[PDB]
Amino acid sequence: PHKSSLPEGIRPGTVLRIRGLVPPNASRFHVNLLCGEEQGSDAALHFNPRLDTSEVVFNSKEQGSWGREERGPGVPFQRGQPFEVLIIASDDGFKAVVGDAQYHHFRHRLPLARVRLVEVGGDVQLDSVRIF
Template sequence: MPEDKMEIYHMELKKGMALKLKGKINDDTSRFTIDLGQDPGNIALHFNPRFDENVIVCNSQNGGHWEQEHRDDHMCFRPGTEIKLTVTFEEDEFQVKLPDGHQVQFPNRGKCSHLPYLCVKGISLTSFKLD
């Protein structure tokens, strides 16, 4: 079964902006992923709630190599549910506002100032917006 995936390669996400995503988590998924970065091998923010482990994993990838994981055990997602997420892109960190108001922070390890790449897997998006 092919994996649902949406990719954008020429996005204008810059420091100080927010990415707002709305959609439905796929019914039959054990995890979903939101990747923001330069390209598929250089990811500044890998946001990955894992239902099978009941944890949210954040990481970054540099030249195709994963770096150290940050794990947050605040799981407020369930397969088959509608979600709204806001990712705020700051100078030194990303702030991900979860549907229940909890925030997950992850450092901007590469000190990126512009992120053209977005990949979303495991969610059927109904909207996304840059603010």
């Protein structure tokens, strides 16, 4: 479970870059942008590649409740293989890039200014997590 606190929050122009490996027997992993360090904190972005159901879901969470799910085209991950993801913050929302192409655009639901933490967890082998 990787954690990067963002005490001063994030602005348009923030780039989260994640490099890692999906274990041979992965079912799913996630990348969350949370609004606090405490369990149950709202999620501005929840990014959830699911190898077991061959999807990638996007969602937010407010007052403990999940919002409407968005999904991207199939699943640009595959068990046993390295990956690289960028999550890019803009004024409009977050851009998710996998490999060499933008994968999904997730329009802001919560104010970007609320974001205070990055969590990466689940069946993922993490090589590096860098915030630029």
